[PDB]
Design an enzyme around this catalytic site. Structure first.
Site, PDB file in Angstrom:
ATOM      1  N   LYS A  97      44.716  13.749  44.470  1.00  0.00           N
ATOM      2  CA  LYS A  97      45.203  14.240  43.152  1.00  0.00           C
ATOM      3  C   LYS A  97      45.982  13.099  42.517  1.00  0.00           C
ATOM      4  CE  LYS A  97      46.668  16.544  39.643  1.00  0.00           C
ATOM      5  NZ  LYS A  97      45.681  17.043  38.631  1.00  0.00           N
ATOM      6  N   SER A  98      45.788  12.857  41.246  1.00  0.00           N
ATOM      7  CA  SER A  98      46.616  11.831  40.572  1.00  0.00           C
ATOM      8  C   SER A  98      48.109  12.182  40.765  1.00  0.00           C
ATOM      9  CB  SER A  98      46.337  11.762  39.052  1.00  0.00           C
ATOM     10  OG  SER A  98      45.033  11.221  38.847  1.00  0.00           O
TER      11      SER A  98
ATOM     12  N   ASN B  28      40.555  22.604  31.416  1.00  0.00           N
ATOM     13  CA  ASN B  28      41.853  22.538  32.126  1.00  0.00           C
ATOM     14  C   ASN B  28      42.912  21.790  31.365  1.00  0.00           C
ATOM     15  OD1 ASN B  28      43.004  19.834  33.580  1.00  0.00           O
ATOM     16  ND2 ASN B  28      40.745  19.685  33.481  1.00  0.00           N
TER      17      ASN B  28
ATOM     18  N   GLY C 108      48.379  19.740  33.776  1.00  0.00           N
ATOM     19  CA  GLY C 108      49.725  19.122  33.607  1.00  0.00           C
ATOM     20  C   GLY C 108      50.186  18.313  34.747  1.00  0.00           C
TER      21      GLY C 108
ATOM     22  N   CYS D 201      46.924  10.115  30.106  1.00  0.00           N
ATOM     23  CA  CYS D 201      48.384  10.226  29.789  1.00  0.00           C
ATOM     24  C   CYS D 201      48.853  11.578  29.130  1.00  0.00           C
ATOM     25  CB  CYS D 201      48.880   9.098  28.838  1.00  0.00           C
ATOM     26  SG  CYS D 201      50.579   8.515  29.125  1.00  0.00           S
TER      27      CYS D 201
ATOM     28  N   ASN E  17      50.417  13.854  26.096  1.00  0.00           N
ATOM     29  CA  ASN E  17      50.615  13.659  24.645  1.00  0.00           C
ATOM     30  C   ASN E  17      52.039  13.224  24.267  1.00  0.00           C
ATOM     31  OD1 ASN E  17      49.324  13.723  22.041  1.00  0.00           O
ATOM     32  ND2 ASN E  17      50.980  15.188  21.432  1.00  0.00           N
TER      33      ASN E  17
ATOM     34  N   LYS F 214      40.204   4.833  36.241  1.00  0.00           N
ATOM     35  CA  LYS F 214      39.567   6.070  35.785  1.00  0.00           C
ATOM     36  C   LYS F 214      39.684   6.144  34.237  1.00  0.00           C
ATOM     37  CE  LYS F 214      37.959  10.399  36.365  1.00  0.00           C
ATOM     38  NZ  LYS F 214      38.672  11.358  37.170  1.00  0.00           N
TER      39      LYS F 214
ATOM     40  N   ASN G 209      36.659  10.695  33.004  1.00  0.00           N
ATOM     41  CA  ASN G 209      37.566  11.861  32.963  1.00  0.00           C
ATOM     42  C   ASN G 209      37.017  12.953  32.027  1.00  0.00           C
ATOM     43  OD1 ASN G 209      40.060  13.298  33.310  1.00  0.00           O
ATOM     44  ND2 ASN G 209      41.055  11.365  33.764  1.00  0.00           N
TER      45      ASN G 209
ATOM     46  N   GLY H   6      31.007  13.388  36.089  1.00  0.00           N
ATOM     47  CA  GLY H   6      30.806  14.247  34.954  1.00  0.00           C
ATOM     48  C   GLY H   6      29.489  14.962  35.055  1.00  0.00           C
TER      49      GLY H   6
ATOM     50  N   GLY I  29      33.508  17.199  40.280  1.00  0.00           N
ATOM     51  CA  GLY I  29      34.711  17.877  39.868  1.00  0.00           C
ATOM     52  C   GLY I  29      34.436  19.402  39.755  1.00  0.00           C
TER      53      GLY I  29
HETATM   54  C1  FMN Z   1      41.216  21.178  37.699  1.00  0.00           C
HETATM   55  C2  FMN Z   1      41.032  19.691  37.397  1.00  0.00           C
HETATM   56  C3  FMN Z   1      41.982  18.740  37.652  1.00  0.00           C
HETATM   57  C4  FMN Z   1      41.804  17.380  37.443  1.00  0.00           C
HETATM   58  N1  FMN Z   1      42.768  16.451  37.725  1.00  0.00           N
HETATM   59  C5  FMN Z   1      42.531  15.185  37.536  1.00  0.00           C
HETATM   60  C6  FMN Z   1      43.443  14.163  38.019  1.00  0.00           C
HETATM   61  O1  FMN Z   1      44.452  14.522  38.681  1.00  0.00           O
HETATM   62  N2  FMN Z   1      43.058  12.915  37.862  1.00  0.00           N
HETATM   63  C7  FMN Z   1      41.903  12.531  37.232  1.00  0.00           C
HETATM   64  O2  FMN Z   1      41.635  11.319  37.185  1.00  0.00           O
HETATM   65  N3  FMN Z   1      40.994  13.389  36.725  1.00  0.00           N
HETATM   66  C8  FMN Z   1      41.290  14.694  36.924  1.00  0.00           C
HETATM   67  N4  FMN Z   1      40.372  15.657  36.504  1.00  0.00           N
HETATM   68  C9  FMN Z   1      39.098  15.133  35.912  1.00  0.00           C
HETATM   69  C10 FMN Z   1      38.011  15.126  36.891  1.00  0.00           C
HETATM   70  O3  FMN Z   1      38.303  14.116  37.902  1.00  0.00           O
HETATM   71  C11 FMN Z   1      36.692  14.714  36.273  1.00  0.00           C
HETATM   72  O4  FMN Z   1      36.847  13.418  35.666  1.00  0.00           O
HETATM   73  C12 FMN Z   1      36.219  15.732  35.225  1.00  0.00           C
HETATM   74  O5  FMN Z   1      36.493  17.093  35.631  1.00  0.00           O
HETATM   75  C13 FMN Z   1      34.742  15.553  34.901  1.00  0.00           C
HETATM   76  O6  FMN Z   1      33.921  15.749  36.058  1.00  0.00           O
HETATM   77  P1  FMN Z   1      33.112  17.159  36.253  1.00  0.00           P
HETATM   78  O7  FMN Z   1      32.158  17.318  35.111  1.00  0.00           O
HETATM   79  O8  FMN Z   1      32.464  17.004  37.604  1.00  0.00           O
HETATM   80  O9  FMN Z   1      34.175  18.268  36.288  1.00  0.00           O
HETATM   81  C14 FMN Z   1      40.566  17.015  36.814  1.00  0.00           C
HETATM   82  C15 FMN Z   1      39.603  17.968  36.546  1.00  0.00           C
HETATM   83  C16 FMN Z   1      39.810  19.289  36.806  1.00  0.00           C
HETATM   84  C17 FMN Z   1      38.678  20.265  36.479  1.00  0.00           C
HETATM   85  C1  W86 Z   2      49.802  19.327  28.392  1.00  0.00           C
HETATM   86  O1  W86 Z   2      50.875  19.412  29.281  1.00  0.00           O
HETATM   87  C2  W86 Z   2      51.469  18.288  29.917  1.00  0.00           C
HETATM   88  O2  W86 Z   2      52.674  18.250  30.212  1.00  0.00           O
HETATM   89  C3  W86 Z   2      50.665  17.254  30.443  1.00  0.00           C
HETATM   90  C4  W86 Z   2      49.279  17.182  30.256  1.00  0.00           C
HETATM   91  C5  W86 Z   2      48.519  16.153  30.810  1.00  0.00           C
HETATM   92  C6  W86 Z   2      49.098  15.189  31.550  1.00  0.00           C
HETATM   93  C7  W86 Z   2      48.311  14.167  32.070  1.00  0.00           C
HETATM   94  C8  W86 Z   2      47.189  14.723  33.061  1.00  0.00           C
HETATM   95  C9  W86 Z   2      46.550  13.623  33.915  1.00  0.00           C
HETATM   96  C10 W86 Z   2      45.814  14.267  35.138  1.00  0.00           C
HETATM   97  C11 W86 Z   2      44.583  15.002  34.685  1.00  0.00           C
HETATM   98  C12 W86 Z   2      44.523  16.367  34.565  1.00  0.00           C
HETATM   99  C13 W86 Z   2      45.628  17.276  34.683  1.00  0.00           C
HETATM  100  O3  W86 Z   2      46.351  17.193  35.688  1.00  0.00           O
HETATM  101  O4  W86 Z   2      45.897  18.051  33.716  1.00  0.00           O
HETATM  102  N1  W86 Z   2      43.356  16.975  34.078  1.00  0.00           N
HETATM  103  C14 W86 Z   2      42.258  16.263  33.784  1.00  0.00           C
HETATM  104  O5  W86 Z   2      41.181  16.806  33.411  1.00  0.00           O
HETATM  105  N2  W86 Z   2      42.285  14.891  33.939  1.00  0.00           N
HETATM  106  C15 W86 Z   2      43.405  14.220  34.406  1.00  0.00           C
HETATM  107  O6  W86 Z   2      43.367  12.993  34.481  1.00  0.00           O
HETATM  108  C16 W86 Z   2      50.498  15.212  31.739  1.00  0.00           C
HETATM  109  C17 W86 Z   2      51.262  16.225  31.204  1.00  0.00           C
END
Ligand code: FMN
Ligand code: W86
Ligand code: FMN
Ligand code: W86
Ligand code: CAC
Ligand code: CAC
Lengths: 313, 313
Positions: free
Chosen positions: A44-45, A68, A71, A131, A133, A165, A195, A250, A272
Site C-alpha cells: 500500500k502506498s 475510490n 485517502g 497527491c 488535492n 507510478k 493509476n 489498468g 487492481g
Molecule cells: C481501493 C484502491 C486503492 C488504491 N490505492 C493505491 C495506492 O495506495 N497507490 C497507488 O499507486 N495506486 C493505488 N490504487 C490504484 C491502483 O493501483 C491502480 O493503478 C488502479 O486501480 C487501476 O488498475 P485497475 O484497473 O486494475 O483497478 C488503488 C486502487 C484502488 C481500487
Molecule cells: C480526498 O481525500 C484525501 O484526503 C486524500 C485523497 C487522496 C490522497 C492521495 C491518494 C494516493 C493513494 C491512492 C489512492 C487512495 O489511497 O485514495 N487511490 C488511488 O486510486 N490511487 C492512489 O494512488 C490523499 C488524501
C-alpha cells in the site's frame, strides 16, 4: 511452458502482481499476496505517519469497474519498512514498496531510510507521483516542473534504481513532456502506467445519490472503464522510454487483457479492481489464460510479443 | 409528465440531441436528424475549408464504446452556414452549429459570418475547444492561456450568446482553473461536457493490431468507457458555473444514463457512440425510458431533479 522472467536484477515466476493499494495494507494482506501465485507484490502506498484515510464508503465496485477515494489509509512507513526488512520471504517472490509522501521532504526522508534495506534485502521502490488535492495546485505528475523536482530530490536521496507510478495522460504533447522528464533520470528504471483515472463520478439511479462519501462522490476509476486508457499510456511510454521498463496497470480481468498490456509494452502486469473483486485466486486464472493464448498463437516467451502491437501501415 | 425544456430563448421538445460529429456531416445526415424525435441537432464541427479527414479505418466500435481519429472531415463552413441560413426547418427543432477552427483566426473568421444568421434565424454556436492549435502543444482546452485567448477573440467577434464543447478533466485543480476561465466570459451561456476521452488505444487480441489507422491507433474514446468521467465533468462545471447551462455528453445509451446526466446537472443531453451504433430510432427509446423512470419516481418535469444528485452526509 512457464512464464518466469528477469527484471531489475530480480527473478519473477510470472509477470503478475497486485496493483498498489489492493490487498496490501496489513501484514495479513502482504502475507496473503506472498502466498498467492502472483509473480511479485507491492505494498500500500505509505506516508511517514499512519493514516486512517477517508470516511466510508470510500470504495465501490460495479460490473464495469470501481471508484475510490480511499485517502491514503496505511499503517505508516515504519511498518512497511519492517515488513520489508524483517518479515517478507524473498525466497517466495520480489517485493515492491510504494511510497506516497504528502511533500517532497517526506518522500526524501522515507527514501533515505529505505535505501539500506533496498541494498540489503532487494526490496524495490515504486514512487507514487499521485497527491492530495491542494487548491490552486495539480497533482505532481500533472505539474511537469514539480515532477522534475521531486525526481531530482528522490534520485539524490535514494541513489538506487526505482520506479514511478504515473497517472494517465490524454494528450500527446503531455506524453512527450512527461516522458522527457522521466528520461532525465537514469535511476528511474520502470514506469507503471497507470493509476486510476482521476475524479470520475458514479451515481446510483434508484437512490439518486453518489456512491462514495468523500469528495462529494468524485473518485478514481479502475477496471473495465480504463483498459484502452491504460494500454495507450503503456504504449506511449514504451515508445518514448526505450531504456526503461514499463509496468502495465489498468483494466486487467483476464489473460487476454494481460496479453494486450504486454503487446503494448508491459513487463509486469498489475491487477487492481479485478483482484479486489475476485480475490487472490485470480492469479492462477490469469496465468493459465495467458499461457493458453500464447500456446494458441505459437508464442513460447513473453519477449516474442512484448511491445509488438501492430499498427495499420 | 413532461420532457420540454425552454432555454437559450428556444423551446425543446425533449433534452436529447446528437453529439457533434455523429449523424451530422452531410445534408442527408442533417435532414435525418431533423426528421428524428430528437429535441435538437448539432452539425459536424467545421473548418473554413472542406476536409477529407484522416485515412480509414478511423472509427471503430465495440461493446463498451468507440474509438476515433476522424481528423475533422467536414464539408466546410460555407455549407453548414447555408444549411443554417436556407435549409433548416426551425419549426421542427433548434439547430446548433459546431465550429472547430484550427487557429484562433479561423474561428474568428467563421463566427463573424455566423453572427448575422444566428441573429436572424436563431442557430446556436457550439465552439469546440478540444481541438489542436500549435502541434506539440496540448489541445486548446488543456492550455488555459490559449483557451482564454480563443474565448476573448470569439466573444468580441461574435457578440452573441454561445457555448463551448470541453474535453474531460481529471484533476480538481483543472476543474477549478477551467471553470474560472469560462466564468470570465459572460457570452458563454452553455458548457458541453464532454468530448471524447483523448488518446485511448484499443488493441485487437486476435490480430495483435490497433484498430484505427491514424496516430498509430491512438484515438478518442466514447461510450460505456466514459460515463463516470462525463458525469463528473457535468457535475463539476454545474457546481462551478452557476450562471451557465451545462449540456451532458458521454456514455448515454439509455434513459437511465440520461437521468444520471440530468441529476448531475445536464440540461441538454447529447448522444454520440450510441446513436452512431443504433441510429436515430434511439431517440424514441431514450424518451420512453426517461419518462418511465420519471413516472416511477413521481417526477413531472426535468427541473424537479436536474442538478439534484445527493451526496453522502
Ligand atoms: C481501493 C484502491 C486503492 C488504491 N490505492 C493505491 C495506492 O495506495 N497507490 C497507488 O499507486 N495506486 C493505488 N490504487 C490504484 C491502483 O493501483 C491502480 O493503478 C488502479 O486501480 C487501476 O488498475 P485497475 O484497473 O486494475 O483497478 C488503488 C486502487 C484502488 C481500487
Ligand atoms: C480526498 O481525500 C484525501 O484526503 C486524500 C485523497 C487522496 C490522497 C492521495 C491518494 C494516493 C493513494 C491512492 C489512492 C487512495 O489511497 O485514495 N487511490 C488511488 O486510486 N490511487 C492512489 O494512488 C490523499 C488524501
Ligand atoms: C465519429 C465521431 C466523430 C466526432 N466528431 C466530433 C466533432 O466533430 N466535434 C465534437 O465536438 N465532438 C466530436 N466527437 C465527440 C462526440 O461529440 C462526443 O463528445 C463523444 O463521442 C462522447 O460521447 P459518447 O460517449 O456519446 O460517444 C465525435 C465522436 C465520434 C465518435
Ligand atoms: C489526427 O490527425 C489530424 O489531422 C487531426 C486530428 C484531429 C483534429 C481535431 C478534431 C476535432 C473534431 C473531433 C473529432 C474528429 O473529427 O476527429 N473526434 C472527436 O472525438 N472529437 C472532436 O472534437 C484535427 C486534425
Ligand atoms: C484487504 As484490506 C480492507 O486491508 O485492503
Ligand atoms: C506467432 As506466429 C508463429 O502465428 O506469426
Amino acid at each position: 511452458m512457464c512464464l518466469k522472467l528477469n527484471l531489475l536484477d530480480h527473478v519473477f515466476a510470472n509477470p503478475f502482481m497486485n496493483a498498489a493499494g489492493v490487498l496490501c495494507s496489513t501484514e495479513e494482506d502482504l502475507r496473503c499476496m506472498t502466498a498467492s501465485s502472483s509473480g511479485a507484490l507491492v505494498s500500500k502506498s505509505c506516508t511517514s505517519a499512519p493514516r486512517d484515510g477517508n470516511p466510508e464508503p470510500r470504495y465501490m465496485a460495479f460490473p464495469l469497474g470501481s471508484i475510490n477515494s480511499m485517502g491514503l489509509p496505511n499503517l505508516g512507513f515504519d511498518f512497511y519498512l519492517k515488513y520489508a526488512s524483517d518479515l517478507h520471504d524473498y525466497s517466495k517472490k520480489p517485493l515492491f514498496l510504494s511510497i506516497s509522501g504528502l511533500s517532497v521532504e517526506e518522500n526524501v526522508a522515507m527514501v533515505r531510510r529505505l535505501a539500506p534495506v533496498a541494498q540489503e534485502k532487494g526490496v524495490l521502490l515504486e514512487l507514487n507521483l499521485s497527491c492530495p488535492n491542494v487548491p490552486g495546485k495539480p497533482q505532481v505528475a500533472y505539474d511537469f516542473e514539480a515532477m522534475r523536482t521531486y525526481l531530482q530530490q528522490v534520485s539524490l536521496a535514494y541513489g538506487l534504481p526505482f520506479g514511478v507510478k504515473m497517472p494517465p495522460y490524454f494528450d500527446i504533447a503531455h506524453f512527450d513532456t512527461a516522458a522527457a522528464v522521466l528520461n532525465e533520470f537514469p535511476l528511474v528504471k520502470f514506469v507503471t502506467c497507470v493509476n486510476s483515472v482521476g475524479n470520475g463520478l458514479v451515481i446510483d439511479a434508484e437512490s439518486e445519490s453518489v456512491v462514495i462519501k468523500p469528495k462529494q462522490g468524485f473518485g478514481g476509476l479502475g477496471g473495465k472503464y480504463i483498459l484502452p486508457t491504460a494500454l495507450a499510456n503503456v504504449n506511449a511510454f514504451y515508445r518514448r522510454c526505450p531504456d526503461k521498463l514499463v509496468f502495465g496497470c489498468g483494466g486487467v480481468y483476464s489473460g487476454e487483457d494481460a496479453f494486450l498490456h504486454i503487446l503494448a509494452g508491459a513487463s509486469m502486469v498489475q491487477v487492481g479492481t479485478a483482484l479486489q473483486e475476485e480475490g487472490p485466486g485470480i492469479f492462477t486464472r490469469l496465468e493459465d489464460e495467458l499461457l493458453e493464448i500464447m500456446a494458441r498463437k505459437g508464442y513460447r516467451t513473453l519477449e516474442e510479443f512484448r511491445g509488438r502491437v501492430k499498427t495499420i501501415e
